[PDB]
């Protein structure tokens, strides 16, 4: 019947155009007055902008809900109570193609892992299409007739997805995020674990209790973790002298020091990609060549510059406590033998997070924390006593204070554990500004 797209934006434009091409009657509604993508819709599509049209939504045979709109909205609740199907664009993609899907979610590392396994598949000779994130709408991936899809899927997208029937699926990790929408970790975990509906194979993280799914006994499962792996699992092996290798069972695969991506969380990301690749048949020799060359993504605990024998790291995309914990632990362990310590810049919009999990790593590895942003007082209350705490009113002042506090073999880390919008346009803006500050140090 009538398909009603609820919420425009990039994915909403993708859904309207896809449904129109396939010969459906499509209407669209959005609360914003003139929504992004107004100029990108075909004329003749009925549009009800300015108000989320409750009457139009109740006229629908099916509603295609933007991931930016909660199913809990009262207008959407009224439709669900009438029995109207509410799905997202990922559901449209699933119906449109039979090709194998590699499905990836998790609180952190989704884009890093999605990019890497996509590169592993491409380098191995697969006609792969990679997307699902903002700006890579999943329906547009059908255009080039790929033989394989690699989808980065958010908890919001998974909430409205059923019977994904992935060739292989993974929840990489979970930590506190997106509770403004999901309410609590219960709702959040349930949303992500929809990625396993009909999954043909499962990869899971041995070291994260919220990764392993409940699936039928016939469903093959393979795990990764940061310990010596069991037979046919992924993990780490240490030589007698301590040298760390990525490994599968008893076989050593590649030294972690031979990767460009650093820190045990990136070792785990690489191992997850090897397991995803094994599930779709990629040869190990090819996967390791891809892995050796992979540089990691911008603003993901990224090396910027060395100034006076102190290395500076941009982790502006560390927008939650779990990401920042990984950054502190990774740099702290890396410099421990040379007796270096971390000077950490923390703060911004804290989103009501529990900052307690940072205390032990700050106490172990940090010589100073410089607090910025609107939730600096709440964060200070949580980390008081763990190490020396300073305040700065601007990012530039924070970088200068960290420079003053550090000596050769220390590192300076911007890993805010917070959203950026109280002082910046985006985490990208915050990271670019950090790089500019570092480049202006003398
Ligand atoms: N396995 C991991 N566990 C925790 N934090 C991680 C992990 N991998 C990367 N991070 C950090 O998480 C943040 C987001 O990384 P990213 O790959 O962009 O994730 P996503 O696409 O899920 O947002 C960055 O601060 C990055 O350094
Ligand atoms: Ca992402
Ligand atoms: Cl942000
Ligand atoms: Mg997220």
- In angstroms, how far is the first alpha carbon of the chain from the final one? 66
Secondary structure, 3-state, 4-61: EEECCHHHHHHHHHHHHHCCCEEEEEECCCCCCCHHHCCCCCEEEECCCCHHHHHCCC
Q: Which of 3, 178, 193, 265 is catalytic?
A: 178
**DSSP secondary structure of 167-179:** SEEEE----S--H
Tell me if 368 sits within 8 A of 344, measured CB to CB.
Answer: yes
Q: Report which DSSP code applies to 161.
A: -
Token pair of 22 as six digits: 């396939």
Single out the residue of 174, 434, 152 nearest to residue 304, CA to CA. Answer: 434
Entry field: residues in the chain:
442
Report residues whose beta carbon is within 6 angstroms of any ligand 1 atom. Answer: 106, 108-112, 173, 265, 268-269, 297, 300-301, 315, 317-318, 322-323, 326-327
β-sheet with 388-391: strand ranges across: 302-307, 310-314, 411-414, 342-347, 366-372, 388-391
**DSSP secondary structure of 382-427:** HHTTSSEEEE-SSHHHHHHHHHHH--TT-EEEE--SSB-TTTSSSH
Calpha distance 158→169 (Å, rounded): 12
Single out the residue of 345, 362, 350 nearest to residue 414, CA to CA. Answer: 345
- Kindly give the interhelix angle for 264-279 and 284-293, rounded to the nearest 10 degrees: 150
Hey, how many other C-beta atoms are within 10 angstroms of the C-beta on 209?
9
Calpha distance 336→366 (Å, rounded): 11
Widest distance between CA atoms in the chain: 70
Calpha distance 406→344 (Å, rounded): 11
CA 265 to ligand 1: nearest atom? 1
What is the whole-number distance in angstroms between the Cα of residue 59 and the centre of ligand 2?
A: 34
Single out the residue of 274, 272, 238 nearest to residue 257, CA to CA. Answer: 238
Q: Report which DSSP code applies to 157.
A: H
Method: X-ray
Single out the residue of 407, 404, 392, 416 nearest to residue 344, CA to CA. Answer: 416
* Known catalytic membership, residue 178: yes
Tell me if 130 sits within 8 A of 114, measured CB to CB.
Answer: yes
Token pair of 17 as six digits: 């155009």
Calpha distance 116→322 (Å, rounded): 21
Q: Which residue numbers belong to the known binding site?
A: 106-112
Strand bridging mode 85-87 / 101-105: unpaired
Q: Which residue has the CA at smallest separation from atom 26 of ligand 1?
A: 300
Q: Which of 38, 46, 133, 200 is catalytic?
A: 133
What is the whole-number distance in angstroms between the Cα of residue 310 and the centre of ligand 4?
A: 31
């Amino acid at each position: 019947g009538l398909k009603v797209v609820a919420g425009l934006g990039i994915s909403g434009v993708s859904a309207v155009n896809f449904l129109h091409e396939q010969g459906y009657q499509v209407a669209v509604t959005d609360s914003r007055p003139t929504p992004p993508g107004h100029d990108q819709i075909p004329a003749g599509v009925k549009t009800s902008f300015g108000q989320l049209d409750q009457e139009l939504l109740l006229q629908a045979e099916e509603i295609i809900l933007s991931p930016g709109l909660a199913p809990q909205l009262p207008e959407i609740q009224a439709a669900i109570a009438k029995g109207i199907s509410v799905v997202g664009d990922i559901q449209l993609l699933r119906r449109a193609t039979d090709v194998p899907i590699v499905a990836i979610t998790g609180s952190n590392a989704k884009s890093t892992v999605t990019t890497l396994i996509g590169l592993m598949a491409k380098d191995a000779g697969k006609k792969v299409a990679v997307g699902g994130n903002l700006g890579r709408p999943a329906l547009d991936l059908l255009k080039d007739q790929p033989e394989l899809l690699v989808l980065e899927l958010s908890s919001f997208q998974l909430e409205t997805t059923s019977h994904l029937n992935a060739e292989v699926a993974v929840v990489l990790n979970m930590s506190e995020d997106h509770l403004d929408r999901h309410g609590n970790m219960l709702g959040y975990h349930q949303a992500k674990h929809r990625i396993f509906q009909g999954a043909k194979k499962v990869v899971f993280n041995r070291d994260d209790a919220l990764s392993r799914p409940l699936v039928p006994d016939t469903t093959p499962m393979q795990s990764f973790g940061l310990n010596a792996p069991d037979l046919n699992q992924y993990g780490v092996l240490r030589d007698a002298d301590g040298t760390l290798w990525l490994a599968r069972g008893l076989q050593r695969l590649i030294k972690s020091s031979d990767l460009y991506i650093q820190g045990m969380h990136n070792v785990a990301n690489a191992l997850a990609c090897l397991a995803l690749g094994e599930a779709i048949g990629l040869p190990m020799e090819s996967m390791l060549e891809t892995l050796k060359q992979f540089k990691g993504l911008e603003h993901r605990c990224e090396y910027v510059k060395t100034v006076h024998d102190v290395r500076y790291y941009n982790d502006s995309k560390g927008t939650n406590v779990g990401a920042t914990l990984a950054a502190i632990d990774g740099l702290g362990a890396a410099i421990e033998v040379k007796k270096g310590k971390v000077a950490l810049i923390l703060g911004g919009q804290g989103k009501g997070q529990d900052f307690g999990p940072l205390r032990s790593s700050i106490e172990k590895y940090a010589k100073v924390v410089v607090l910025i942003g609107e939730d600096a007082p709440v964060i200070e209350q949580a980390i008081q006593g763990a190490t020396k705490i300073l305040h700065a009113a601007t990012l530039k002042e924070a970088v200068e204070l960290c420079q003053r506090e550090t000596q050769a073999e220390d590192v300076v880390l911007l890993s805010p554990a917070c959203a950026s919008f109280d002082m910046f346009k985006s985490y990208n803006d915050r990271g670019q500004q950090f790089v500019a500050c570092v480049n202006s140090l003398v």
